[PDB]
């Protein structure tokens, strides 16, 4: 099992969600970036694992559930079994990470990607060990009801470039944004 990563897109006012949707209109290449980063495995024969909260799972359209080409895991303390279309369910991020060491997943999983929402990012960002944060900075304010926690810059470094990630400003539908990658070796 490989690296532990978070990936998120966040508006200038720290928003990630609104009424079960994204706060901004759909940004095709931001979606394509999310898909490619979380699907691409560095190891032949293996897939990446995506971990997500329950609300994030249900915010994905049923046609795109589970996220194709990745092993999906949902976090919830209320559900008694993984939701329809999912095969894994854990009570906490720590439980999910321990699950990756059992044979059913250790043989299959390369990278682990936390894909939201708010409380999952919070638990992950404080988790000890090596962690990278792939943060898309959406350079506008959008009305949101779900937010990304502020990054502790005493713990993380901001990398000027990361392989395969363009460092220049992007623009779609009149909205500019930028891909950032943070790292800690805690
Ligand atoms: N912009 C982005 O990058 C991005 C990414 C993801 C989602 N989103 C948006 O954000 C919203 C969803 O995020 P959200 O923060 O509202 O919800 P969420 O974190 O996806 O789901 C929250 C629920 O998941 C369970 N849960 C979450 N963290 C847990 C943890 N660490 N351990 C155990 N259970 C945990 C709990 O369910 P139980 O009560 O059943 O225990 C909790 O009520 C939607 O609007 C979605 O569109 C945006
Ligand atoms: C692309 C957004 C994103 N961008 C970065 N950089 N990181 C993330 N974690 C992230 O959220 C991915 C999970 C939340 O998804 C959604 C939630 C509400 C509405 C639509 C989606 C996208 C769906 C999907 O995810 O496939 C669907 F289009 F299929
Ligand atoms: Cl921040």
Swiss-Prot record:
Subunit structure: Homodimer.
Consequence the record notes for mutating residue 35 to K: Increases affinity for dihydrofolate about 3-fold. Reduces affinity for NADPH about 3-fold
Gene Ontology cellular-component terms listed: cytosol; mitochondrion
Gene3D superfamilies, A to Z: Dihydrofolate Reductase, subunit A
Name listed for the protein in its UniProt record: Dihydrofolate reductase
UniProt similarity note: Belongs to the dihydrofolate reductase family.
CDD domains, sorted: DHFR
Pathway recorded for this protein: Cofactor biosynthesis; tetrahydrofolate biosynthesis; 5,6,7,8-tetrahydrofolate from 7,8-dihydrofolate: step 1/1
Taxonomy of the source species: Eukaryota, Metazoa, Chordata, Craniata, Vertebrata
Organism the protein comes from: Homo sapiens
EC number: 1.5.1.3
UniProt-listed PANTHER family: DIHYDROFOLATE REDUCTASE
